[PDB]
Curated annotation (Swiss-Prot):
Recorded GO MF terms: hydrolase activity
4Fe-4S recorded as keyword: no
Coiled coil location: none
Highest rank taxon of the organism: Archaea
Protein family membership: Belongs to the ADP-ribosylglycohydrolase family.
Protein name per the record: Uncharacterized protein MJ1187
Gene3D superfamilies cross-referenced by the UniProt entry: ADP-ribosylation/Crystallin J1
Keywords: Hydrolase
Enzyme Commission identifier(s): 3.2.2.-
InterPro entries: ADP-ribosylglycohydrolase, Ribosyl_crysJ1, Ribosyl_crysJ1_sf
Signal sequence annotation: none
């Protein structure tokens, strides 16, 4: 009830915060992150390929596409037209960090072509948490809206199977669920979309040290890299802060790893558990707050 609000407020801000904290470390290796910044513990001015292009405390394309999906949502679900049009709106604003996949996909959406490109990049999974929120109870309805909202852009079984695991874990986090049995349940929830991916989530059961986990699955943009190791960070840490430090210092596609971990961790741990320094340091919180209020209303009824 009153907890629901803390969790949702924590999930959204968890996703945006992770996205902004990981922004300066994206496309860098662990060795590089250490040299350029040392141990990242808070927002830092970018020294990667985004230096100059984005100021510290700002969110990237991850949060932008998420804002798109949130504005096209209702109890009835996702309004694909409104969604695609908003993605286009952002795409035509000259994003400094838009991905190749998102570029090609938002291009076909301009030609009223909703078949989407075919890549396993995490583009779909990095913006799925809003669904996991609004439909935390209806796992069948969630699956429908999830495949729907991410098919138009990433028409790839792996890409879709990944977004599902995330939506799955976000809704479970909202039900104060957080244990390894979730791994064998999610597997059944998605295996019918990609057995090879789902079978990869189950491998987390054999690890206990995130460092090895990142070195095993990988932290790049491929969905079968960031999604599994993000879910693994969520399950292998005991508080919100701990997990994020692992994400942002992991190297690779840190911004999406971090964003996805934050969506889950935020949902489970709550807003009040998010280090206040990461909240004050975030830029333009009023836009995120309004979007959080919205998801709360949708989820609340
Ligand atoms: Mg990005």
């Amino acid at each position: 009830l009153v907890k629901m609000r803390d969790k949702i407020l924590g999930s959204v801000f968890g996703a945006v915060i992770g996205d902004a904290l990981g922004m300066p470390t994206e496309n860098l290796t662990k060795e590089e992150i250490k040299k350029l910044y040392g141990f990242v513990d808070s927002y830092v001015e970018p020294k990667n390929y985004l230096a100059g292009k984005l100021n510290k405390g700002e969110w990237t394309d991850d949060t932008e596409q998420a804002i798109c999906l949130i504005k096209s949502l209702t109890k009835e679900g996702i309004d694909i037209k409104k969604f695609a049009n908003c993605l286009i709106a952002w795409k035509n604003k000259n994003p400094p960090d838009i991905g190749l996949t998102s570029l090609m996909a938002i291009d076909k959406l301009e030609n009223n072509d909703y078949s989407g490109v075919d890549s396993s990049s995490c583009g779909a999974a990095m913006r799925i948490y809003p669904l996991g929120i609004v439909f935390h109870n209806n796992l069948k309805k969630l699956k429908e809206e999830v495949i729907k909202a991410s098919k138009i852009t990433h028409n790839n079984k792996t890409a879709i199977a990944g977004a599902l695991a995330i939506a799955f874990f976000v809704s479970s986090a909202l039900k104060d669920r957080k244990d390894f049995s979730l791994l064998d349940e999610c597997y059944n929830y998605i295996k019918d979309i990609d057995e090879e991916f789902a079978k990869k989530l189950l491998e987390i059961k054999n690890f206990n040290n995130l460092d090895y986990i990142y070195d095993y699955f990988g932290t790049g943009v491929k969905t079968d890299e960031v999604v599994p190791s993000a879910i693994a960070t969520y399950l292998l840490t005991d508080n919100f802060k701990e997990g994020m430090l692992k994400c942002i210092n992991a190297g690779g596609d840190t911004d999406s790893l971090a964003s996805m971990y934050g969506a889950m961790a935020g949902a489970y741990y709550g807003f009040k558990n998010i280090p206040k320094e990461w909240i004050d340091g975030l830029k333009n919180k009023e836009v995120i707050f309004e979007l959080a209020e919205r998801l709360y209303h949708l989820a609340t009824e």
